[PDB]
Amino acid sequence: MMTYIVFILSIIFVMGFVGFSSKPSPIYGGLGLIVSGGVGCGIVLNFGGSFLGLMVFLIYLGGMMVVFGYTTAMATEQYPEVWVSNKVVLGTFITGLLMEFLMVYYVLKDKEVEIVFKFNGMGDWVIYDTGDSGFFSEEAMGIAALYSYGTWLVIVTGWSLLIGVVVIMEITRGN
Amino acid sequence: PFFDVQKKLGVDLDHWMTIQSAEQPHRIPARCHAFEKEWIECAHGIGSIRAEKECKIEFEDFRECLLRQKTMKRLNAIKRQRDKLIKEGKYTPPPHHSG
Amino acid sequence: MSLVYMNIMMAFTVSLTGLLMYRSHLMSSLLCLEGMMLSLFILATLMILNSHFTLASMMPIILLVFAACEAALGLSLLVMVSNTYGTDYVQNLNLLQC
Amino acid sequence: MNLMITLLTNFTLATLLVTIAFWLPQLNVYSEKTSPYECGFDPMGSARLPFSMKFFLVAITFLLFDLEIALLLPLPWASQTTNLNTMLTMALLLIFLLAVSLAYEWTQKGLEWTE
Amino acid sequence: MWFEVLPGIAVMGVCLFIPGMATARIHRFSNGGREKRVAHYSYQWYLMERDRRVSGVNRYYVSKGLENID
Amino acid sequence: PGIVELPSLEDLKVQEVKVSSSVLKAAAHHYGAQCDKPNKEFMLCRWEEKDPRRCLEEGKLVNQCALEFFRQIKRHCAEPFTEYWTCIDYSGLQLFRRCRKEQAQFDKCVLDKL
Amino acid sequence: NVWAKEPVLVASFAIAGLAVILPTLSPYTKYSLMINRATPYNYPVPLRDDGNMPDVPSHPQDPQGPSLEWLKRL
Amino acid sequence: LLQAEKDRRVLQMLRENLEEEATIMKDVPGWKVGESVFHTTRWVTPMMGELYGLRTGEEILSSTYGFIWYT
Amino acid sequence: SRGEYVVAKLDDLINWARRSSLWPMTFGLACCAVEMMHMAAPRYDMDRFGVVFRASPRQSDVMIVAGTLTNKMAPALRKVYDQMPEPRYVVSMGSCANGGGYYHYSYSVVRGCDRIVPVDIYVPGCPPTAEALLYGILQLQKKIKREKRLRIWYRR
Amino acid sequence: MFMINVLTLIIPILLAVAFLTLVERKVLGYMQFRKGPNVVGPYGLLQPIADAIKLFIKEPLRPATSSISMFILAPILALTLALTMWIPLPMPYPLINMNLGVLFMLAMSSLAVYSILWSGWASNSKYALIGALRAVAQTISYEVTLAIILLSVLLMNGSFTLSTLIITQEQVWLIFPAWPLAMMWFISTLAETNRAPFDLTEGESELVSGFNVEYAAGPFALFFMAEYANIIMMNIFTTTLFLGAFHNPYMPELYTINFTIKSLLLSITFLWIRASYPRFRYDQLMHLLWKNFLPLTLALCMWHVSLPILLSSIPPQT
Numbered sequence A: 001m002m003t004y005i006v007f008i009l010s011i012i013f014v015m016g017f018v019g020f021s022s023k024p025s026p027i028y029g030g031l032g033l034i035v036s037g038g039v040g041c042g043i044v045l046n047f048g049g050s051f052l053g054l055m056v057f058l059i060y061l062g063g064m065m066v067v068f069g070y071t072t073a074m075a076t077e078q079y080p081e082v083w084v085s086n087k088v089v090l091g092t093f094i095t096g097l098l099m100e101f102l103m104v105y106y107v108l109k110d111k112e113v114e115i116v117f118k119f120n121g122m123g124d125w126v127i128y129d130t131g132d133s134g135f136f137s138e139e140a141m142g143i144a145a146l147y148s149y150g151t152w153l154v155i156v157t158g159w160s161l162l163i164g165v166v167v168i169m170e171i172t173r174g175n
Numbered sequence B: 001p002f003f004d005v006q007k008k009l010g011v012d013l014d015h016w017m018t019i020q021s022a023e024q025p026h027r028i029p030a031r032c033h034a035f036e037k038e039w040i041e042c043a044h045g046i047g048s049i050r051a052e053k054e055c056k057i058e059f060e061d062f063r064e065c066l067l068r069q070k071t072m073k074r075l076n077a078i079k080r081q082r083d084k085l086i087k088e089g090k091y092t093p094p095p096h097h098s099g
Numbered sequence C: 001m002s003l004v005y006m007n008i009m010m011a012f013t014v015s016l017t018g019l020l021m022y023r024s025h026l027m028s029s030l031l032c033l034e035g036m037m038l039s040l041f042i043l044a045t046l047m048i049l050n051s052h053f054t055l056a057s058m059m060p061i062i063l064l065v066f067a068a069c070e071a072a073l074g075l076s077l078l079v080m081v082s083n084t085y086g087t088d089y090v091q092n093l094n095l096l097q098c
Numbered sequence D: 001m002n003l004m005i006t007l008l009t010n011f012t013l014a015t016l017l018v019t020i021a022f023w024l025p026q027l028n029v030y031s032e033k034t035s036p037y038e039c040g041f042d043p044m045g046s047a048r049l050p051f052s053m054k055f056f057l058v059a060i061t062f063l064l065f066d067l068e069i070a071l072l073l074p075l076p077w078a079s080q081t082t083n084l085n086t087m088l089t090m091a092l093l094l095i096f097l098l099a100v101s102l103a104y105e106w107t108q109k110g111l112e113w114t115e
Numbered sequence E: 001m002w003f004e005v006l007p008g009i010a011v012m013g014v015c016l017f018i019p020g021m022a023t024a025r026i027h028r029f030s031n032g033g034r035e036k037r038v039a040h041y042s043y044q045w046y047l048m049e050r051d052r053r054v055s056g057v058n059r060y061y062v063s064k065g066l067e068n069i070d
Numbered sequence F: 001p002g003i004v005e006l007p008s009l010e011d012l013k014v015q016e017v018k019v020s021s022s023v024l025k026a027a028a029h030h031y032g033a034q035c036d037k038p039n040k041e042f043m044l045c046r047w048e049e050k051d052p053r054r055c056l057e058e059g060k061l062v063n064q065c066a067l068e069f070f071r072q073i074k075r076h077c078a079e080p081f082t083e084y085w086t087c088i089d090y091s092g093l094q095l096f097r098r099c100r101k102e103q104a105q106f107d108k109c110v111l112d113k114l
Numbered sequence G: 001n002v003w004a005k006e007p008v009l010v011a012s013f014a015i016a017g018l019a020v021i022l023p024t025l026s027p028y029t030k031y032s033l034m035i036n037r038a039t040p041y042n043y044p045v046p047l048r049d050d051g052n053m054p055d056v057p058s059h060p061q062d063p064q065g066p067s068l069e070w071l072k073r074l
Numbered sequence H: 001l002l003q004a005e006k007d008r009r010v011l012q013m014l015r016e017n018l019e020e021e022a023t024i025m026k027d028v029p030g031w032k033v034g035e036s037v038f039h040t041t042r043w044v045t046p047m048m049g050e051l052y053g054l055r056t057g058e059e060i061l062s063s064t065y066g067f068i069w070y071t
Numbered sequence I: 001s002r003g004e005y006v007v008a009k010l011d012d013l014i015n016w017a018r019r020s021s022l023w024p025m026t027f028g029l030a031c032c033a034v035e036m037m038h039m040a041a042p043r044y045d046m047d048r049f050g051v052v053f054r055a056s057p058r059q060s061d062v063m064i065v066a067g068t069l070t071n072k073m074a075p076a077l078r079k080v081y082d083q084m085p086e087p088r089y090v091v092s093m094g095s096c097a098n099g100g101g102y103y104h105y106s107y108s109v110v111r112g113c114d115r116i117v118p119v120d121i122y123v124p125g126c127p128p129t130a131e132a133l134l135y136g137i138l139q140l141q142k143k144i145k146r147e148k149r150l151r152i153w154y155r156r
Numbered sequence J: 001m002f003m004i005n006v007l008t009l010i011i012p013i014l015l016a017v018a019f020l021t022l023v024e025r026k027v028l029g030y031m032q033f034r035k036g037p038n039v040v041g042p043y044g045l046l047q048p049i050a051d052a053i054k055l056f057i058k059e060p061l062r063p064a065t066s067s068i069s070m071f072i073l074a075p076i077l078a079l080t081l082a083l084t085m086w087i088p089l090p091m092p093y094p095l096i097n098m099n100l101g102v103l104f105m106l107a108m109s110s111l112a113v114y115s116i117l118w119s120g121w122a123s124n125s126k127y128a129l130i131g132a133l134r135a136v137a138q139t140i141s142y143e144v145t146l147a148i149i150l151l152s153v154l155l156m157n158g159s160f161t162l163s164t165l166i167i168t169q170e171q172v173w174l175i176f177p178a179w180p181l182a183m184m185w186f187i188s189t190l191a192e193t194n195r196a197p198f199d200l201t202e203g204e205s206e207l208v209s210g211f212n213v214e215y216a217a218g219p220f221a222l223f224f225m226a227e228y229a230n231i232i233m234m235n236i237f238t239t240t241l242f243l244g245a246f247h248n249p250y251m252p253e254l255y256t257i258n259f260t261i262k263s264l265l266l267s268i269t270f271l272w273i274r275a276s277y278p279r280f281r282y283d284q285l286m287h288l289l290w291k292n293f294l295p296l297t298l299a300l301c302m303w304h305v306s307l308p309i310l311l312s313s314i315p316p317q318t
C-alpha cells in the first residue's frame, strides 16, 4: 500500500527532531536525538545510500554518548523536566507537532505548498535512477576519493583535528 | 580578493572538485553531464552578465535537468486528472498488465 | 522538487529556532548545534545522491567531522564554564556587563 | 523493510514480554516498595545532584579519535586505484598524525589525571 | 573429569545448530530447490530482474531452461 | 517548448533471446568470441550518437546474432552444456570455480567438434 | 637501554618504522600498479575505423594490442 | 545485448505511455500531447515515472525499490 | 472437573517453579554470615539447589537474617525487607536472630527478629550447622510445596 | 516462509541463553572444585526453564521518581537490539545479505551500551548513576580500539561482506596473518561484551549491580538475556571473523556443525577466563587500554596498509 515511505520516515524524523530541538532535559533530548539519527539513517539508507547513513549513525551517536556524559557530569536541576511537564515545553512540542500534521494535511489534500519554494506533493520514487548498469557502486568509489584525488583536503582536515587536540588540552591546561 | 596561486604555481588541487563533467574517478557519467557541457561551452569567454543575457536558455535547460520541475508538474497534472476521471467513472483503463 | 526536501528544510528551521531561543542550558544549545549539523548532513547527502554526482561525496564526511570537532570544542568550553562556576546556566553569565 | 519486519517482530516480542510481566502473575500492592534504596538507609535528596566527574579530556579525546576513525575507515576502497603513491602516502600521513596527537597528549600528561 | 558437563554443552549446541539447518532448509524450500541468488550490486539486480522478467510467472527461479531457442 | 517523436510499435518487434540469465552469463566467453564482432558497430553508434531510438537496426542485428549463436550451440555439440549451466546456476551468485569439470568437458566438445 | 623503557611501545615503534621504510625498497609496487591498471570496470569502447593506425587491433584475438599473460605465468 | 534489451524495453514503455497520456488527458484544454519539457531536442534520460507511472503500486514498488531493501 | 483439574496442574507447575531456585540475599550480620560462607563451601554446595548469591535485594527470593540484630541496625533491616518481589520469605538463621540468644537481655538487641519481620523458617544453633541450614532450606521448599495458591483462588 | 525464518532465529537464541546460564553455573562449579546443579530435574535443565518461569512470576514494580517512559523503554530497546544484531550473521546463508555487516555490528553494540546507560539513568537511585558512568568510561575506552582493529582485519581480505569473508577463509585462517591483533581484539571483545571482570567494572561486589540496582524484578530477565546474547553474539562474530572451515560446497550441515563446535568451545574459553581472574580498575582501564593497545594497533594498521603494497595482496574488491 505504501509508496511514500521516504516521506513517511521523514515525518517520523521531523517529529522526533522537533521534540529534540524543543529543549527538554538534555537526556530526553538525547533520546530524541538517537531516535532521529536512527530514522535519518533509515531515510538515507532506503533512498539508496549504501553505507554513509550507518557511518553517520555510528559517529554522530558516539558524539551523543559524550554529550550524555557531560550533561550528567555538569549541571542538572533538582527535578529534571520532560516534554509534558512545563507550560512552554509542552506548548512548543505540541505546536511543532501541529506544524507537522498541518503540512501533512495541506500536502495530502492539496496540490502544492509554496512557503519558500514550489514543493511537489508526491513521494520520491520520482525523480530517480532508471537502472544504470553500473557495478562501480557510486558511494564506494566516491569515498574511494579523498585518497587518490583528495590531496590537500585530508591534509587540512587532519591538521584541523591535530590543532583541535592541542587546543582542547591547552584550554583545560590554561589554569 | 580572489588570489589564484592555484593557477600561478601550476598545481590543480581545487579545480578537480568543481562541477559535473570533471573527472569522476572511474569513467562514468553524472545525471546531467551533457547539459553542463552545453552551458559551459556557451559561457566561457563571456563577462558573466551576457551569460544571463545570452546563455539563459541552456542554463535553464540544465536547471530543469537537475530539478525536473516542469516534468513533475506535468506528471502531477496527469495523475490528478486520472484521479478525477476514475472518480467520475469514465473508462477505468486496462492498458497495464494487458493489451 | 523531491518532497522529502521540504521536511528536511523544516527540520533545519526548527533546529535553528531551537538554537536561538533557549531557557537555561548551554548543553542544550550545543545539542541543537549537533542537530543542525545532522540536518545539513542529510540534506546535502540526499542532494548528492539525487545528482549521482559521486565524485564530490566529500560534503557528508568532511562537513560532519569538522562540525563535530566544533562540538567537541564547545563541550570543552562548557567544561571550563562549569569549572569556574557552580553550574552552566545562562544566568550567572551576566557579569562582564556591557 | 525486511529488517524493519525483523524490528517489528522483536518489538512485538518485547512488548509481549512487558505485558506478560505486568498483567499475568499476581497483584500490585505498592506504597513502600517504591522508596529509593541505596544500601539500607534513607539518603539525602536523590540523584540528579551535580556529580562532578574525574575525566575531562578523555571524552573529547574519544570524540576526536572517533572522527579520525571516520576519516580512516575507507581503507579498502583506498587500496584499488592507479595512484598507489598518493594512496599509501596520505594513509601513512593520517595514521602518523593520529599517533602525533596521541604522542603530544601522552607526553603532556593529558591522560595522567583522574582517569 | 568433564564427564558430566558434556550433555549441557551438547544440548545447547544443538540449540545453536537449529538456526543454520533451519535457515538452509527454508532457503532451499523457498526458491524451487535453488540456493538463493544473492544480489550485491545493481548489475546483479538487473540480471536478476530480466531473469524474473523472462519467466512468465514472475518468479526468477524457474529459469526456462534452454527451450525458447525457437 | 519543442516537440518529440517516438518510434511506433511497427519498429519495436524484435524477438528476445528469452533464455535465463544464468546460462547467458555462463556462455559469455564464447558468446563474445564467435558472435559480437558486428555489435561493436552498434556500440560505436551508441556512443558516437548517444541516441538510442536511432541505433535500433543494429540492435535487431545483434539480437539475431545472439539467437543464431544459441541456435548453433543447440543444434550441434552438445547436450551436457545443459548440465554445465545448471551446474553454474545453483551456487547463489555465479562463481566460475564452483564447476570446472563440466566447463572442461563442454570446452572439449565445442573445441574438438566445432 | 632504548628497548625496555616501555617495551611494547618500542616494539610498536619498530614495526611502525619498518612500515614506513620498507615500501620504498619494493619489487612489487609495479606489479600492483599493473594488475590494478588491467582490471577494467567499464566497457572498452570501439573507435572510428582508423587513419590506418598500425596498432589498437581489429580483433581482440590478435595480440597486436596490449594483452596480459603474466597472471598464469607467475 | 543487455544494452539493446534495455533500449527496446524503455522505448516500449515510452511509446505505450505516451499513448496512455494521449488517451487519458485528451479532454481537459491546454495540454499538447507529447511535447518535450526542454527547449532543445535530445534524448533526455527518463525518471522512473515517465517509465513507471500509474503501474498500480506493486509494479513500481518492485521496480524502483527492490534492490534497495531486498536481496 | 476440567476447570479445577487445570487449576491444580498450573498451581503445581508454578509452585515447582517457585521451589526450584530460591536465590537469597547475602545479608549476614555476624558469624552466622561465616556459617553462610561455609554453606558456600565445596563440601556442602548450594548451587545444587539453585540457591545462588544475589546481593541486590530487589530480586532475592528469601532473606536469610543471620547475625545479631540490633536497634541501630533494625530500621535498615526492615527498610531492606519492605522492598522485594511480592513473594517473600524469611529464614532466621541462628540463636541471635531467632529469639535473641545469648544477648537476649542487654539493650540495643531486638529480642529476636520476630518483632520486626514475619519469620517463616527458623533454624536454631550457635552456629547452626551448614547441614542444618540446608535442611532448613529444604523444609522451606516443602512449605512451597504446600501453597495451594491457585486452588484457593479458583474455589474463592 | 520469511516469518518462519524469523521464528527460527528468535526461538533458538532463547534456549541458547537459558542453557548458557546452566553451563555458566555448571562449568563455574566444576572450575571451583565443587559440583553444579545436579539434583533438580534432569541433570540441570528444567531448573533454568524454572528460572524463566520463576522470574516471570515476581511481579515487577516501579521506583519513586523513575520516569516510566524512559524506564520501560530502556530494556526493551536492549533486548530488541540484542536480537537485531544477529541479522547478517553468515550461518551458512544469513537472514539479510547485507553489503556491509561489521560497521552494523559496531552500531548495534553502541546501542546496547545506550540501553545500559538509559537503564542506569532512569533507575534513579545514585548507584545506578555510579554504574552508568562506569559503563560510559569503559565505552569511551572500547569503541576506538575494537573498531580500528576491525578495520585492520577487514582491510586485507574482508571488504565488509561476510560472504566474501567466508570465501577468504579457505587456505589459511586469518589468525595466522594477524595473531597479536587478534589477541588485542579478543581482549576488547571481552571488555565491550561486559562479561569476565578481567575487563568489566559493572557487576562488581564494590558496587551492587550498577546496571540493575533497582530496575524491577520482571525485566531482569530481559537485561540478563541481552548480556548473554552479547556473549554468544561476539563469540559467533569472533568465530566467523577470524577462522573456521572451508565449507562443504552447497551443503550446509557440515559447516554448521563445525562452526557451532568452534564457537561454543571458544565461548567455554571465554567463561573459563571469567572464572579465573580478579576484577579491574577505572584509571587502570584508561591507562592500560590507551597506553598499551593504541600505538600497537596503529602500527598493525599501517603495516596491514603497506602489506598489500609490499606483497601485492590488494583484495579483489567487488
Ligand code: SF4
Pocket: I030, I031, I032, I033, I066, I067, I068, I093, I094, I095, I096, I097, I101, I125, I126, I127, I128
Ligand atoms: S548465633 Fe552464634 S554463630 Fe550465629 S551470629 Fe550469633 S553468636 Fe554468631
